């Protein structure tokens, strides 16, 4: 894709949609055929997102929130404490963390999305409508993908839910609620003599867009801050026709302004007609009982604490020449060393460094701003902190946490960690995870994506030479309520006693206790051994650096043909997978054994010959296992 490079983000004519904004080719799991490469798309150290998700919208938005310093630092900062019950918050945490430490390596938003769907479906007020209006937007099935004006609703909902969960952390922070918090006094005047004051702290600000009898974005924001409207809705208390007047007034200027554009197509045409509509930088002040915004501080000097806002980023909708539609995120990040900003454009797994001129241009007929994030100038230059700067709670590794505690069909006795064998950097463990299926792809055009799998069980055993060497310390079955298409019992080894009503075993919740276990281990620096680990991690939705793998599949790989650890065992040991399917601890154990064996054969410097031997013998024998 080089002739016209896929990363070309500019065209000669304004009507032509650049390759960078185009419909990217469908990604798939490492195939098979064939294995997909993301290196042509992303040349930055900033990770893109796997478009293989149902929500469709969120990816862009996710990126938009990834580069808000306060947002990022707080959300990833909450990970140090357990916070199991706050699903969306913590999942957004793990996701942010992963995107940060992947450093350009492709990331998936599958777990966060699964949490979102699990929440929105976790029902049988007026918010319920805003909840169930997402499943109509989720799981596609609605002609062309994007219908106005859902992303704004996604913004409002996400911020709201994150605030609600923020209220119920272990420290009950108001950080996000104080950051996005617009103290909005909305007053309803039933009559001139007598009026009515509702007060709401709103995380985002809706923008229309009517009259305002220069023509850039600032007076829009100003109008949305302080406006007088009338409503047509008749009050039922009389049954008569009631036209009420209502004034909405924003009182404060928070560190982050989240703006949701709800304009007409004609108004968008008026924006594209204008130039520099999206103001890169402005100054605001609270005068009287109104917020006033001007481009420079000299257009109005003001009195008290004049605030400076600079464009952090924005999510925009692109409608291609095909009339297909998709979301794309422009975002800005600060380089303090050179005292200058650099711009990034995110289109799923395509990430490109762009000029500010191109990032601010709104004149393109194929481009339409949807969500806009402004940030306090000083807060925007704060460094993005990592959770590694905090002391973290690893206590979940040393105790039991599950519902409910019936504990039947316990499997082989795994004993827990003690602080004498506390796992620090360099320590090694064996791991195997088994999944179940829930859905199955679509055909889409023939005269559209393989999905979906769900984590069912995960087993981690010790790898350090001790009394309990090779003895499991983790063997958890995952909490999953949703329907299971196929259990893959012959491949997975489920009972299936997966259901919480049918306690069955040590069923444990992946929100995100097991995920927190793995993430803590990886964050500590534990290297993981096993067979076929990449796919496992893709289904756990976690990314481990390759210097902690240690994958027998890769080592014993020859001629690009991946062999079953059943075959490897059977040839080099007693066949355990044949009798009897199926157990994760068994696969992990034999994988550990295989790694140690590989270490032996490597130390003796004879293993290339035994590789060419097991393959000569195999290729000749065509991989048949006696039984
Ligand atoms: Mg396995």
Q: DSSP letters of 504-573?
A: TTTEE-TTTHHHHHHHHHHHHT-EEE-SSHHHHHHHHT----GGG---HHHHT-BTTBPPPHHHHHHHHS
Q: Which of 515, 544, 522 is nearest to 454 (CA)?
A: 515
**Listed residue (359, 351, 354) closest to 104, CA to CA:** 351
**How far apart are the CA of 612 and the centre of ligand 1, in A?**
26
340 marked as binding residue: no
Rg (CA), the chain: 28
Whole-number Å distance, alpha carbon 90 to ligand 1 midpoint, is: 27
CB neighbour class for 575 (10 Å; exposed up to 12, middle 13-18, buried from 19): middle
Q: What is the distance in A from the centroid of ligand 1 to the CA of 168? A: 37
- Find the 588 Cα to ligand 1 centroid distance in Å: 7
Do residues 478 and 458 lie in contact, with contact meaning Cβ atoms separated by under 8 Å? yes
Q: How much distance in Å is there from the Cα of 434 to the middle of ligand 1? A: 6
Q: Tell me the β-bridge partners of 313.
A: 331, 373
In the structure, how many helices (H) and strands (E) does the chain have?
Answer: 18, 18
Q: How far is the C-alpha of 377 from the C-alpha of 30, rounded, in Å?
A: 42
Structure tokens at 150: 């859902």
Output the CA 211–ligand 1 centroid distance in Å.
63
Kindly give the distance from the C-alpha atom of residue 516 to the centroid of ligand 1, in angstroms, as a whole number.
20
How close is the Cα of 104 to the center of ligand 1, in Å? 28
| Rounded-to-integer distance, Cα 75 and Cα 65, Å | 10
CA distances from 437 to 109, 482, 518 (A): 18, 11, 22
Instruction: Measure 531 CA to ligand 1 centroid, in angstroms.
Output: 8
Where exactly does CATH 3.90.70.10 map onto the chain? 1-391
Distance 432 CA to ligand 1 centre (A): 5
Distance CA(156)–CA(205), nearest Å, equals 9
Alpha helix (H) residue ranges in 15-68: 58-66
Q: Measure Cα distances from 408 to 500, 502, 582 in Å.
A: 12, 10, 18
Whether the bond into 579 is cis, omega within 30 of 0: no
Asked if omega into 512 is within 30° of 0 (cis), the reply is yes
Tell how far the Cα of 587 is from the centroid of ligand 1, in angstroms: 5
Cα(490) to centroid(ligand 1), Å: 11
CB of 250 closer than 8 Å to CB of 184? yes
Q: Is 222 in contact with 285 (CB distance < 8 Å)?
A: no
Cα Dmax for the chain: 96
DSSP 42: B
Cα–Cα distances in angstroms (integers) from residue 377 to residues 69, 97, 282, 530, in the given order = 11, 24, 10, 48
Three-state SS for 491? helix
- Asked if 479 and 510 touch (Cβ cutoff 8 Å), the reply is yes
What are the DSSP E strand ranges found in 60-119? Answer: none
Residue whose token pair is 């106005």: 148
What lies within 8 Å, CB to CB, of 53 at 6+ separation is 59, 108, 109, 110, 113
Q: What are the beta bridge partners of residue 558?
A: 561
Contacts of 578-583 with CB under 8 Å at 24 or more apart are 578/625, 578/627, 581/489, 581/490, 581/491, 581/493, 582/434, 582/489, 582/490, 582/491, 582/492, 582/493, 583/411, 583/493
Backbone torsion region of residue 541, taken as left when φ is above 0, otherwise alpha when ψ lies between -120 and 50, otherwise beta: left
Element (H, E) at 595: helix 584-603
Residue 263, number of CB atoms within 10 A of its CB? 20
CA separation, residue 492 to residues 220, 489, 498 (Å) = 56, 5, 12
Q: How far is the CA of 576 from the centre of ligand 1 (A)?
A: 12
If you measure from the C-alpha of residue 333 to the centroid of ligand 1, how many angstroms do you get, rounded to a whole number? Answer: 41
Distance 316 CA to ligand 1 centre (A): 42
Using CA atoms, how far apart are residues 291 and 267, in angstroms rounded to an integer? Answer: 23
Alpha carbon of 493 to ligand 1 centroid (Å): 9
Q: Structurally, what CATH architecture does the domain formed by 1-391 represent?
A: Alpha-Beta Complex (3.90)
Distance (Å) from CA 584 to ligand 1 centroid: 5
* 462 CA to centre of ligand 1 in angstroms: 16
Taking the centre of ligand 1 as the mean of its atom positions, its distance from the CA of residue 93, in whole angstroms, is 28
Contact 477, 507 (CB under 8 A): yes
State in Å: Cα 506 to ligand 1 middle.
Answer: 18
> Residue 443 annotated as binding?
no
Q: Do 352 and 344 form a contact (C-beta atoms < 8 A)?
A: yes
Q: What is the dihedral of CA 178, 180, 185, 188, to 10 degrees?
A: -140
- According to the annotation, is 238 in a ligand binding site? yes
Annotated binding residue 434: yes
**Would you give the DSSP letter of residue 24?**
P
What's the CA-to-centroid distance between 86 and ligand 1, angstroms? 30
**Judging by DSSP bridges, how do beta strands 244-250 and 194-202 pair with one another?**
unpaired
- Token couple for 529: 């051994």
Residues, CB-to-ion distance under 5 Å, ligand 1: 432, 587
CB 596 within 8 A of CB 617: no
| Helix-, strand-, coil-residue percentages of the chain, each rounded to 5 | 30, 20, 50
Q: Are 548 and 526 in contact (CB under 8 A)?
A: yes
CA pair distance 517, 505, nearest whole angstrom = 19
Q: What's the gap in Å between 107 CA and the centre of ligand 1? A: 22
500 is an annotated ligand-binding site residue: no
CA angle 318–321–326, rounded 5-degree value:
25
For ligand 1, the distance from its centroid to the CA atom of residue 278, given in whole angstroms, is 52
How many Å apart are CA 201 and CA 164, to the nearest integer?
12
Across the beta sheet with 453-462, the strand order is 507-508, 472-478, 453-462, 428-437, 527-529
Contact (Cβ atoms closer than 8 angstroms) between residue 469 and residue 478: no
Q: Quick check: helix, strand or coil at residue 607?
A: helix
Map residue 104 onto helix, strand or coil.
coil
**Helix, strand or coil, per DSSP, at residue 267:** helix
With beta carbons less than 8 A apart as the criterion, state whether 486 and 524 touch: no
**Sequence-separated (6 or more) residues with CB below 8 Å from residue 534:** 30, 551
If you measure from the C-alpha of residue 101 to the centroid of ligand 1, how many angstroms do you get, rounded to a whole number?
26
Q: Which two tokens stand for residue 435?
A: 């999944």
530 C-alpha vs ligand 1 centroid, how far in Å?
8
Stated in angstroms to one decimal place, the resolution of this structure is 3.1
Q: How many CB atoms lie within 10 A of CB 564?
A: 14
Reported residue count of the chain is 627
Please give the distance, rounded to the nearest whole angstrom, from the Cα atom of residue 538 to the centre of ligand 1. 14
Output the CA 438–ligand 1 centroid distance in Å: 19
Confirm if 432 and 552 have CB atoms less than 8 A apart: no
Q: What are the b/e assignments for 219-251, b being 16+ CB within 10 Å?
A: ebbbebbbbeeeeeeeeeeeeeeeebebebbbe
């Amino acid at each position: 894709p080089e002739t016209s490079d896929i990363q070309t983000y500019t065209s000669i004519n304004k009507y032509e949609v650049p390759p960078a904004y185009s419909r990217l080719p469908l990604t798939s799991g490492r195939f098979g055929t064939d294995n997909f490469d993301f290196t042509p798309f992303n040349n930055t150290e900033y990770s893109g997102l796997d478009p293989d998700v149902d929500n469709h919208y969120t990816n862009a938005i996710i990126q938009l929130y990834r580069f808000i310093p306060e947002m990022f630092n707080f959300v990833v900062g909450c990970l140090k404490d357990e916070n199991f019950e706050t699903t969306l918050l913590t999942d957004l945490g793990y996701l942010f963390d992963m995107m940060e430490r992947s450093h350009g390596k492709i990331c998936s938003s599958s777990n966060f999305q699964a949490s979102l769907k699990s929440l929105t479906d976790k029902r049988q007020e007026e918010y319920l409508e805003s909840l169930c209006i997402r499943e109509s937007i989720e799981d596609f099935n609605s002609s062309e993908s994007i219908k106005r004006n859902m992303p704004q609703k996604f913004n409002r909902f996400l911020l709201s839910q994150l605030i609600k969960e923020e209220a119920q952390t272990v420290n009950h922070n108001i950080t996000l609620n104080q950051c996005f918090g617009l103290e909005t006094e909305i007053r309803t005047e039933c009559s001139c003599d007598h009026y009515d004051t509702t007060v709401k702290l709103l995380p985002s600000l809706s923008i229309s867009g009517i009259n305002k009898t220069g023509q850039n974005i600032l007076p829009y924001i100003e109008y949305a801050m302080k406006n007088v409207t009338q409503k047509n809705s008749i009050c039922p208390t009389c049954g008569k026709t009631e036209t009420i007047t209502q004034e909405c007034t924003v009182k404060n200027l928070p560190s982050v302004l989240s703006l949701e554009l709800s304009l007409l197509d004609t108004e968008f045409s008026n924006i594209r007609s204008s130039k520099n509509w999206l103001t890169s930088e402005f100054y605001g002040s609270i005068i009287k009982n109104k917020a006033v915004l001007r481009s420079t501080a000299s257009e109005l000097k003001g009195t008290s604490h004049i605030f400076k806002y600079e464009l952090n980023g924005y999510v925009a909708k692109i409608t291609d020449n095909n009339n297909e539609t998709r979301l794309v995120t422009y975002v800005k990040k600060y380089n303090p060393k050179e005292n200058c900003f650099k711009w990034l454009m995110f289109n799923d797994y395509l990430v490109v460094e762009i000029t500010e001129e191109e990032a601010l241009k709104m004149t393109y007929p194929w481009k339409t701003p949807e969500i806009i994030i402004y940030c306090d100038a000083e807060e925007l230059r704060k460094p993005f902190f990592s959770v590694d700067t905090y002391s973290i709670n690893y206590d979940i590794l040393f105790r039991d946490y599950f519902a409910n505690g019936i504990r039947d069909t316990a499997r082989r006795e795994y004993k827990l960690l003690t602080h004498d064998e506390a796992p620090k950097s360099g320590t090694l463990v064996a791991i195997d995870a088994e999944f179940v299926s829930l859905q199955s792809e679509l055909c889409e055009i023939d005269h559209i994506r393989p999905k979906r799998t769900a984590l069912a069980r995960i087993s981690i055993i010790r790898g350090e030479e001790g009394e309990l060497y090779g003895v499991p310390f983790v063997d958890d079955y995952v909490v999953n309520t949703n329907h299971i298409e196929d259990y893959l019992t012959r491949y997975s080894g489920i009972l299936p006693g997966d259901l919480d009503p049918e306690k069955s075993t040590k069923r444990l919740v992946r929100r995100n206790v097991v995920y927190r276990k793995v993430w803590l281990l990886m964050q500590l620096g534990c290297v993981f051994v096993g067979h076929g680990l990449n796919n496992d991690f893709k289904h756990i939705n976690i990314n481990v650096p390759r210097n902690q793998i240690r994958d027998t599949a890769i080592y014993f790989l020859q001629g690009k043909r991946y062999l079953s650890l059943r075959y490897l065992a059977y040839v080099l040991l007693g066949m355990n997978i044949q009798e009897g399917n199926h157990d994760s601890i068994e696969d992990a154990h034999t994988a550990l054994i295989l790694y140690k064996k590989y270490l032996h054969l490597k130390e003796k410097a004879i293993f290339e010959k035994v590789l060419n031997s097991v393959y000569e013998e195999g290729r000749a024998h065509n991989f048949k296992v006696p039984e």
